[PDB]
């Protein structure tokens, strides 16, 4: 189901900042990525193994 733009606003008016976050990252598509600390570009070649 869609968490629309207006649902986002209604959640802001409630002030529920954490739910707004969880509903937007945990509940949809979080993604860890690495970034260079100099050129802040997702260009790190992580061999995290």
């Amino acid at each position: 189901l869609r968490f629309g733009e207006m649902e986002r606003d209604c959640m802001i008016a409630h002030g529920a900042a954490s739910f707004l976050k969880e509903r937007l990252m945990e509940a949809s598509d979080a993604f860890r990525v690495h970034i260079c600390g100099i050129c802040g570009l997702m260009t790190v070649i992580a061999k995290l193994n």
Binding site: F31, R32, V33, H34, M42, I45, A46, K47, L48
Partner: protein, 110 residues
């Protein structure tokens, strides 16, 4: 799920926009893209230096992105580059070029 890494986890505090220097592209790029072919010339895996070589990211949930490793759900995809034969306008800036040229001598640059 997602495998443990070690880089310290932070949160973004600032975005600095800004254009892209052609040197920067080349320094980033992992591959010189040359041949319009996608697949390998033998109807098999993929043309190296082709329009998606394996050194760019990979998909199929079955391969490893030989640049940075396996997970199709870890690799963010790595950028490759093409160097044009001759330079061209970037559509977003034609107006901001025509405007600019009208503000500087077209001979000395001042």
């Amino acid at each position: 799920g997602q495998q443990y890494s070690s880089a310290p986890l932070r949160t973004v505090k600032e975005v600095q926009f800004g254009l892209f220097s052609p040197e920067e592209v080349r320094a980033i790029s992992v591959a010189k893209i040359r041949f319009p072919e996608t697949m390998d010339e033998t109807q098999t895996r993929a043309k190296i230096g082709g329009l998606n070589d394996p050194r760019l990211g990979s998909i199929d949930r079955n391969l490893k992105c030989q640049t940075c490793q396996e997970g199709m759900n870890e690799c963010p995809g790595h950028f490759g580059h093409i160097d044009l034969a001759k330079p061209v306008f970037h559509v977003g800036f034609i107006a901001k070029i025509k405007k600019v040229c009208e503000c500087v001598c077209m001979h000395c640059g001042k």
